Amino acid sequence: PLKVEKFATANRGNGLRAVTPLRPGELLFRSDPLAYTVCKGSRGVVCDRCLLGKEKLMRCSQCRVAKYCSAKCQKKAWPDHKRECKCLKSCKPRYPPDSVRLLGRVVFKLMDGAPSESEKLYSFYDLESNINKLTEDRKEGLRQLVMTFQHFMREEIQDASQLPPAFDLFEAFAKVICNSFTICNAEMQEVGVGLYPSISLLNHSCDPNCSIVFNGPHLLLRAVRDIEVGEELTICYLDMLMTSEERRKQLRDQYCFECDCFRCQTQDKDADMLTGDEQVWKEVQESLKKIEELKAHWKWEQVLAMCQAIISSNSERLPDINIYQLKVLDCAMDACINLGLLEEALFYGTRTMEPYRIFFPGSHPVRGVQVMKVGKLQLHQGMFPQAMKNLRLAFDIMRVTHGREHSLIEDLILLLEECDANIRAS
Numbered sequence: 001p002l003k004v005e006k007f008a009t010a011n012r013g014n015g016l017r018a019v020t021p022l023r024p025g026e027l028l029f030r031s032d033p034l035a036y037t038v039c040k041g042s043r044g045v046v047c048d049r050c051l052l053g054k055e056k057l058m059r060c061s062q063c064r065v066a067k068y069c070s071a072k073c074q075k076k077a078w079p080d081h082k083r084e085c086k087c088l089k090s091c092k093p094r095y096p097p098d099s100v101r102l103l104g105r106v107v108f109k110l111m112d113g114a115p116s117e118s119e120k121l122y123s124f125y126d127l128e129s130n131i132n133k134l135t136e137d138r139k140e141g142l143r144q145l146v147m148t149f150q151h152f153m154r155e156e157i158q159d160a161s162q163l164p165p166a167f168d169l170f171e172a173f174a175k176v177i178c179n180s181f182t183i184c185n186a187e188m189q190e191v192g193v194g195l196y197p198s199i200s201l202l203n204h205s206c207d208p209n210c211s212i213v214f215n216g217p218h219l220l221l222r223a224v225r226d227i228e229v230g231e232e233l234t235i236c237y238l239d240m241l242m243t244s245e246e247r248r249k250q251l252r253d254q255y256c257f258e259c260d261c262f263r264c265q266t267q268d269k270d271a272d273m274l275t276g277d278e279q280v281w282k283e284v285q286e287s288l289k290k291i292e293e294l295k296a297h298w299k300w301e302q303v304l305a306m307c308q309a310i311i312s313s314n315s316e317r318l319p320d321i322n323i324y325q326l327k328v329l330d331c332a333m334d335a336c337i338n339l340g341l342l343e344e345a346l347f348y349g350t351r352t353m354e355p356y357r358i359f360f361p362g363s364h365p366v367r368g369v370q371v372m373k374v375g376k377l378q379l380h381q382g383m384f385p386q387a388m389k390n391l392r393l394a395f396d397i398m399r400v401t402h403g404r405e406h407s408l409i410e411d412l413i414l415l416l417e418e419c420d421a422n423i424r425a426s
């Protein structure tokens with residue numbers, strides 16, 4: 001059997017609980033998506049199937065919207081793509097919202113595909129919609145998505161007989177809002193959106209006992225803390241670099257619940273996250289809206305320029321533990337890595353280390369990868385003792401958060417063996 005089970009919680013609907021004590025690093029579930037698509041900003045930049053950023057991609061002959069790294073990827077993707085292809089084509093100039101493209105793949109998967117293992121524990125039909133908690137503002141947004149779906153899919157779906165039985169598009173989009181998974185690449189950049197209905201049983205905590213990590217579209221659910229028999233399994237739905245007030249708004253707006261976890265009751269880390277002059281980090285927070293938009297579109301040169309204007313401003317500066325300063329540093333590190341500016345990348349990366357230790361407590365895949373990036377930059381620059389220490393730290397974290405089932409662990413072990421060989425060679 002499995003190590004987890006669905007159960008009805010007392011006040012958060014259905015959830016997942018351990019059937020037996022779980023232990024940090026234990027693999028609990030792994031799932032391909034019911035449906036997934038590349039995210040808007042990564043479209044044309046990464047392969048539609050494997051979500052890897054190749055320097056050579058080939059677009060689908062028919063729609064010219066889907067792009068693939070290889071014949072292998074377009075073939076393995078053709079079942080999921082064949083019907084949307086006609087739709088994307090017939091709307092050529094327009095491209096639909098990610099949610100619409102995603103729901104299209106859900107519908108085709110449910111109509112034309114064998115039962116999906118992703119629904120082993122919990123199906124798309126089962127997913128929470130929160131419709132009785134939605135604001136009229138949200139409901140209006142969903143109505144527009146319904147009509148967008150109807151437009152985009154009018155070449156393949158003209159009426160209900162071409163939808164699953166009693167399939168309601170409004171409810172379907174409501175489910176998408178609060179059960180969408182952000183698919184991240186190995187470097188922890190957002191590249192796609194997917195539905196993993198069994199995994200959607202996991203409720204949220206700002207101090208979770210499990211973590212999900214993506215290896216392409218494939219999702220690994222791991223325990224990151226000790227977990228007792230019958231204890232509910234939780235993951236954090238949100239970015240860790242967020243104050244309690246910011247988490248409140250997004251958990252309300254997107255997930256329709258008021259978080260009662262101990263961190264939100266205590267404002268845990270809020271004060272440290274907002275150190276520095278408020279006027280400055282308000283401006284940086286504003287600037288980050290565009291920086292992250294640029295990063296989403298892989299516009300690294302422009303990302304770096306905006307980040308440098310902040311990190312090396314001629315006006316007042318922020319401490320690196322300020323979460324908005326910290327985001328700017330991370331964006332600039334990633335841009336430098338992609339632009340081949342490794343000295344500068346390392347300068348920014350090392351500055352994020354201590355803030356990441358604070359804000360990503362325990363075993364968090366984002367900190368694991370950040371430390372691995374820093375260790376990799378140090379290795380490449382011949383800083384073997386430093387690189388080894390960070391690579392070991394990355395492995396300490398990622399043996400828990402990634403595990404041997406994740407291909408990045410093999411890469412990291414190879415970097416450990418290389419770095420150790422250099423240190424031996426003295």
Ligand SMILES: C[S@@+](CC[C@H](N)C(=O)[O-])C[C@H]1O[C@@H](n2cnc3c(N)ncnc32)[C@H](O)[C@@H]1O
Pocket residue numbers: 011012013014015126127128130178179199200201202203204205254255256257258259260
């Ligand atoms: C991914 S689903 C989790 C499974 C859901 N409880 C169910 O019955 O299908 C996310 C939804 O569960 C509820 N939820 C998740 N975490 C919660 C929490 N910490 N407190 C209260 N409700 C929560 C919210 O309605 C949210 O929109």
Ligand SMILES: O=C(O)C(=O)c1ccccc1
Pocket residue numbers: 001002003027028029030031120
């Ligand atoms: O339980 C597991 O460890 C696991 O890897 C798994 C994932 C999906 C279905 C069955 C088992």
Ligand SMILES: [Zn+2]
Pocket residue numbers: 047048049050051052068069070073
């Ligand atoms: Zn590919």
Ligand SMILES: [Zn+2]
Pocket residue numbers: 060061062063064065066081085086
């Ligand atoms: Zn196509």
Ligand SMILES: [Zn+2]
Pocket residue numbers: 205206207247259260261262263264
């Ligand atoms: Zn909370």
